[PDB]
C-alpha cells in the first residue's frame, strides 16, 4: 500500500514515539466516477532519514498488517514521502490507553480493566499463534476505539498499535529508558527477542492498567532502572491488586516460566 506525499494533509501534531513524530492528517484519493474520498488518518513520521530504522519501522507494521484481527490497529499504507518515511494509520478519537487511564482512573473499575486486558490478551494470543513478535507492548501503544457504554451494553474497545522501530536495532540507552517494559533478557542481549518478550511486556502493561496509568519506575534514571533488573526487583502490587499474581507470573525473570496467553486468558476470565 504505497501513498503519495501530495495525497497526505498534515494537521495538528499529536505527540511522538522513539525517533517518530505523530500527526493528525487527511488521506486524499481519487475514486471512480470522479469521486474524491477523504479519510481521517494518523500520520507516523520517521525523524530525519533514519535508514536502518525506517526498514525496521516499516518491516514491523507490514508483517502485522498482513494479518487480520479486530484488536490490531489498521494501517492504510506507507509513503516514501520524499525526505520523509510515513506510516498511514487509522485515526482513533480517544487516543492512547495510557492517556485515557490517567484522566479516567476515577470512573474505571475492575470490570472495565478486565475486559480491556482480555482484548489485549486476545490480540497477543493471535500473534503468538502466528509466531509474530510485537516487541513494544505498553499502554501507550494501545488505542481506545470505543468507550464503555453499559446503557447500550457496549464494552470498551481497544486495539494494539504497531511496534515501531525494533528494540533489536535501537540504542541500548533507549532500551534502558524503556525498563521495565523491555524484558531483562533483552537488556543483556537484544538478540534474545522471543515470543516470551511480549509476555513480560504484557505484565508491565497490566500494571499500567491496574495503576490508573501510572508509569512504573518513570521517576528513576537509567542507571537505577538497570539496577532494578540486576537485583531482580519486581514491581510492587498495584492498589487495585486483583491482578497482582498474574502481573508477577508474566514478569518472571525466567522467560520459560511466563504463562501462555491461553493461560493468561484463563486467569483473566476466572476473576469474572
Curated annotation (Swiss-Prot):
Record's function text: Non-receptor tyrosine kinase involved in various processes such as cell growth, development, differentiation or histone modifications. Mediates essential signaling events in both innate and adaptive immunity. In the cytoplasm, plays a pivotal role in signal transduction via its association with type I receptors such as growth hormone (GHR), prolactin (PRLR), leptin (LEPR), erythropoietin (EPOR), thrombopoietin receptor (MPL/TPOR); or type II receptors including IFN-alpha, IFN-beta, IFN-gamma and multiple interleukins.
Subcellular location: Endomembrane system; Cytoplasm; Nucleus
Organism: Homo sapiens
Written domain comment of the UniProt record: Possesses 2 protein kinase domains. The second one probably contains the catalytic domain, while the presence of slight differences suggest a different role for protein kinase 1.
Residue(s) carrying Phosphotyrosine: 33
UniProt PTM comment: Autophosphorylated, leading to regulate its activity. Also phosphorylated by TEC. Phosphorylated on tyrosine residues in response to interferon gamma signaling. Phosphorylated on tyrosine residues in response to a signaling cascade that is activated by increased cellular retinol. Undergoes Notch-induced ubiquitination and subsequent proteasomal degradation which is mediated by ASB1 or ASB2, the substrate-recognition components of probable ECS E3 ubiquitin-protein ligase complexes.
Assembly mode: Interacts with EPOR, LYN, SIRPA, SH2B1 and TEC. Interacts with IL23R. Interacts with SKB1. Interacts with STAM2. Interacts with IFNGR2 (via intracellular domain). Interacts with LEPR (Isoform B). Interacts with HSP90AB1; promotes functional activation in a heat shock-dependent manner. Interacts with STRA6. Interacts with RHEX; this interaction occurs in a erythropoietin (EPO)-dependent manner. Interacts with ASB2; the interaction targets JAK2 for Notch-induced proteasomal degradation. Interacts with MPL/TPOR.
Consequence of substituting residue 80 to F: In PV, THCYT3 and AML; risk factor for Budd-Chiari syndrome; somatic mutation in a high percentage of patients with essential thrombocythemia or myelofibrosis; leads to constitutive tyrosine phosphorylation activity that promotes cytokine hypersensitivity; no effect on its ability to up-regulate potassium voltage-gated channel activity of KCNA3
Breakpoint for translocation to form PCM1-JAK2 fusion protein, annotated site positions: 173-174
Family recorded in the similarity comment: Belongs to the protein kinase superfamily. Tyr protein kinase family. JAK subfamily.
Involvement in disorder: Chromosomal aberrations involving JAK2 are found in both chronic and acute forms of eosinophilic, lymphoblastic and myeloid leukemia. Translocation t(8;9)(p22;p24) with PCM1 links the protein kinase domain of JAK2 to the major portion of PCM1. Translocation t(9;12)(p24;p13) with ETV6.
Residue range from the parent sequence: 538 to 809 of 1132
Tissue-by-tissue expression: Ubiquitously expressed throughout most tissues.
UniProt-recorded name of the protein: Tyrosine-protein kinase JAK2
Outcome reported for the amino acid change (mutating residue 2 to L): In myeloproliferative disorder with erythrocytosis; requires 2 nucleotide substitutions
Residue span(s) of domain Protein kinase: 8-272
Amino acid at each position: 500500500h504505497k501513498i503519495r506525499n501530495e495525497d497526505l494533509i498534515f494537521n495538528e501534531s499529536l505527540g511522538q514515539g522513539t525517533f517518530t513524530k505523530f500527526f493528525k492528517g487527511v488521506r486524499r484519493e481519487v475514486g471512480d466516477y470522479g469521486q474524491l474520498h477523504e479519510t481521517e488518518v494518523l500520520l507516523k513520521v520517521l525523524d530525519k532519514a533514519h535508514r536502518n530504522y525506517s526498514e525496521s519501522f516499516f518491516e514491523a507494521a507490514s508483517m502485522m498488517s498482513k494479518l487480520s484481527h479486530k484488536h490490531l490497529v489498521l494501517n492504510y499504507g506507507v509513503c516514501v514521502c520524499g525526505d520523509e518515511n510515513i506510516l498511514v494509520q487509522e485515526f482513533v478519537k480517544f487516543g492512547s490507553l495510557d492517556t485515557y487511564l490517567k484522566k479516567n482512573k476515577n470512573c474505571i473499575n475492575i470490570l472495565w480493566k478486565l475486559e480491556v486486558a482480555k482484548q489485549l490478551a486476545a490480540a497477543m494470543h493471535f500473534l503468538e499463534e502466528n509466531t509474530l513478535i510485537h516487541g513494544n507492548v505498553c499502554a501507550k501503544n494501545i488505542l481506545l476505539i470505543r468507550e464503555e457504554d453499559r446503557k447500550t451494553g457496549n464494552p470498551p474497545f481497544i486495539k494494539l498499535s504497531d511496534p515501531g522501530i525494533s528494540i533489536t536495532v535501537l540504542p541500548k540507552d533507549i532500551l534502558q529508558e524503556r525498563i521495565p517494559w523491555v524484558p531483562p533478557e533483552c537488556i543483556e542481549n537484544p538478540k534474545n527477542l522471543n515470543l516470551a518478550t511480549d509476555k513480560w511486556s504484557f505484565g508491565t502493561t497490566l500494571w499500567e492498567i491496574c495503576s490508573g496509568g501510572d508509569k512504573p519506575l518513570s521517576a528513576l534514571d537509567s542507571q537505577r532502572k538497570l539496577q532494578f533488573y540486576e537485583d531482580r526487583h519486581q514491581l510492587p502490587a498495584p492498589k487495585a491488586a486483583e491482578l497482582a499474581n498474574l502481573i508477577n507470573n508474566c514478569m518472571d525473570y525466567e522467560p520459560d516460566h511466563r504463562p501462555s496467553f491461553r493461560a493468561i486468558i484463563r486467569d483473566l476470565n476466572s476473576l469474572f
